[PDB]
Amino acid sequence: MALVENIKQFNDAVSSVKPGDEIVLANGSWNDVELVLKGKGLPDKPITLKAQTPGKVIITGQSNLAFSGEYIVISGLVFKDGATPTGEVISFRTSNEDVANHSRVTNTVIDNFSTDLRQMSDLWVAMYGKHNRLDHNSLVNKRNRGVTVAVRMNSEASRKNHHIIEYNYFGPRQILGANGGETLRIGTSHFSREYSNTTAQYNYFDRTNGEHEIISNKSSGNSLIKNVFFETQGTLTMRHGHFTKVEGNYFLGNRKPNTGGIRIINESQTVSNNYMYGLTGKRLRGALVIMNGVPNSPPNRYDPVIDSAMNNNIVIDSDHIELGAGADAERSAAPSTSEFKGNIILGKSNLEPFTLYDDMSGINFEGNYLNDEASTPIKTGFASTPYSVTTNQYGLKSPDKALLDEIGFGEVKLPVTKEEVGADFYPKNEALVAFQSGKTIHVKAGTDTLTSALATSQGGDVLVLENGADYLLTKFAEVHHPVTIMAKAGKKPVIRSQKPNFINIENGGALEVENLWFDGAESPDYKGNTIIGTSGYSMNINYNLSVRNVKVTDLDVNGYFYFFKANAGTFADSIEIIDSEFSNITGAILQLNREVDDLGVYSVENLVISGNTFTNVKEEVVTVYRGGTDESTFGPMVSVTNNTLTNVGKGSTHRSGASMYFHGVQKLNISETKWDNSAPLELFLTNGGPITVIDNVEMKNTDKIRANNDEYESSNVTYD
């Protein structure tokens, strides 16, 4: 019917709409468009809004879609590189009272509708009203905060909805490094007791690693069944609400880090007939979790587990089954009137997978299996079994056919594949620009030669520098894509700069430097200079920093001169500082303490400091900060091995007054390192389960380890 190519023609076709009529957007770009479509369609005659050719109609800029009435259909659309001017990209409503009932969004795409500020949050699809369908859609590259798809329950109209979120493709989602990165959320805490009755089936979750919750269930009566979780970090949690059915879900961890399974909280839940391979998650992110609750709980906390069944689940090569997880003064109530029956746990990665944080008499264990090699503290309900896991006709590591016939599982096979989900026209091309994957450039020694090479380089390229040659910068050496700046063999070229900062890693940029020498002889007489620094504007694309075999000297023109400053609103998936030497620096080596909100936002996911020497550093070698009490993220994970510190942290300018400072770090491993006439190593351990193993550390002429509390393991700590 009526084809349109502008906002006027479109709103005319909306005003003049009736059951059966189809409004078509013509192939081409639609920038800054706030699409509103109202109308009462019919079961036999539905009011449609479609693309002329699915994939050729593209919506960018400050654009969105709002719709209300009955039997509305949205199909073929694309929403690429832009942002909604409201809180939702696609909305199943037009006002608080006008919601869409019996409507459908299908064969539609949302690719990078992320706001430029990585800190801003918004919902990409917000479902309202009753009996709507959301299927065969691809939603990729969410680089800001908020839920990819949410089911709203703010009013009786949207409650007991019976929505179906089917065959959708949830593309990779980088780590937020803060709370608020769920892929699917059904309801909120304010309306948790109400039944939503939603069904989320046949969806594929591909590396959706936002935070520790891939699905946050926050209402009663929903069914999260037949889904695939390919290498996803975090868990499917029964966050709030009762009577949830979680079955037929395959979780392919492939031994990838921080991969979790299912977390039971609250009442009358049924987690049965799920498959789980190689899940490495622990505590609230275990492969199977049954939490401890808060008795007579406030809605935003945890209801004690009652009347629940975790049965007939296959757990192959996974490390943790957490019973009573989260137990403390707050969560004092252990599961009751529940059961754990006929489970097949086969894995040699952890031979004591069960971690029982409280008494588990409330649970009825019976008919379970655990490989001969592994032990369980649970005296009854468990039977010994040979560790026989063979790759079946579908490529999945399946156990023996007798054990499957005993529990009634059937053929171990995916309920859906990456090829059956999402939009048919849109490709699932990986956004993986690897380091050293491009053309190699040769940089002649001189003034602004590294600057020019960078400016015209491509993503993944390698800039090779002249061994022993002097390089000077007079302009910022900007890094807008992955880049390697190295020199081969063993003659360090000497880089100096007349700007406050040498290299700025900008949005989309990732940097690895090898065999380089940085020196401050040309650095200006300003406080706050740095060798490497992040953008200075929010970076919604995660970065990486690898510093290998580097010399840094004389950063002393003025005070507060750093090696690295990671600005707020920037986030590294990986920071590595290896085989390097640092001398005479008036600031700090790594300033990763700039997140000032105190609500779980931190600057680095993985931090490795190894094989390094530091001499005459007026501030810290490293200061890592994740303030507050948030339990939604895998916090900063730090490793500090084989290092020497000499005259570090003795200055009066840094506020911690430490050589190494750790606040809110969730996995801290310090070993084989020595302190000499430096400032003490400081800890500030926060909530959650912070793993801290300090071993074989020498501390000559240095005041002993500072700490807020003693929740850390310290061995072989030699004073002097």
Residue 672 corresponds to which amino acid? E
**What whole-number distance in Å separates Cα of residue 151 and Cα of residue 188?**
9
With residue 639 as reference, give the H or E element that holds it. strand 637-648
* CA neighbor of 519 nearest in space, from 493, 557, 469, 555: 555
Cα end-to-end distance, the chain, whole Å: 84
Give dist(CA 403, CA 547) in Å, integer: 50
Number of residues that this document lists for the chain: 720
Structure tokens at 466: 């002249």
Asked if 157 contacts 180 with a C-beta cutoff of 8 angstroms, the reply is no
Q: Give me the amino acid identity at 556.
A: D
Q: Give the Cα separation of 304 and 264 in Å (integer).
A: 10
Distance (Å, rounded) from C-alpha 222 to C-alpha 163? Answer: 10
Token pair of 565 as six digits: 């400053």
> What resolution, expressed in A, was reported for this entry?
2.3
Task: Enter the tokens of residue 156.
Answer: 């009786």
d(Cα 567, Cα 541) in Å, to the nearest integer? 14
Helices assigned H by DSSP within 475-576: none
Q: What 8-state DSSP symbol labels residue 395?
A: S
Q: What is the rounded CA–CA span in Å between residue 326 and residue 293?
A: 8
* Nearest alpha-carbon partner for 145 in 104, 110, 174, 111: 174
How far CA 270 is from CA of 59, 216, 225, in Å, comes to 41, 16, 11
Q: How far is CA 485 from CA 162, 431, 556, in A?
A: 55, 22, 24
The number of beta carbons lying within 10 Å of the beta carbon of residue 390 is 9
Q: 427 to each of 75, 139, 424, how far by Cα in Å? A: 17, 11, 8
Q: Which residues pair with residue 62 across a beta bridge?
A: 83
DSSP 8-32: HHHHHHHHS--TT-EEEEPSEEEES
Cα–Cα distance between 88 and 123 in angstroms, integer? 5
Residue 363 β-bridge partners: 338
Q: What three-state secondary structure class fits 404?
A: helix
CB 351 within 8 A of CB 318: no
CB distance 695 to 715 below 8 Å:
yes
CB 649 within 8 A of CB 707: no
CA distances (Å), origin 204, targets 113, 172, 201, 220, 415: 20, 11, 9, 23, 10
Written as six digits, the tokens of 428 are 């699932």
Burial 610-622 (b: 16+ CB within 10 A, else e): bbbebbbbbbbbb
Is residue 332 within 8 Å of 295, Cβ to Cβ? yes
C-alpha distance from residue 262 to each of 68, 274, 291, 545, 636 (Å): 35, 9, 11, 33, 23
Query: What is 3-407's CATH topology?
Result: Pectate Lyase C-like (2.160.20)
Asked if residues 323 and 356 have their Cβ atoms less than 8 Å apart, the reply is yes
Say which DSSP state 7 is in. Answer: H
**What is the torsional sign of CA 689, 695, 697, 699?**
positive
CA distance 306 to 291: 11
Contact predicate 538/567, CB 8 Å: no
Calpha distance 115→537 (Å, rounded): 13
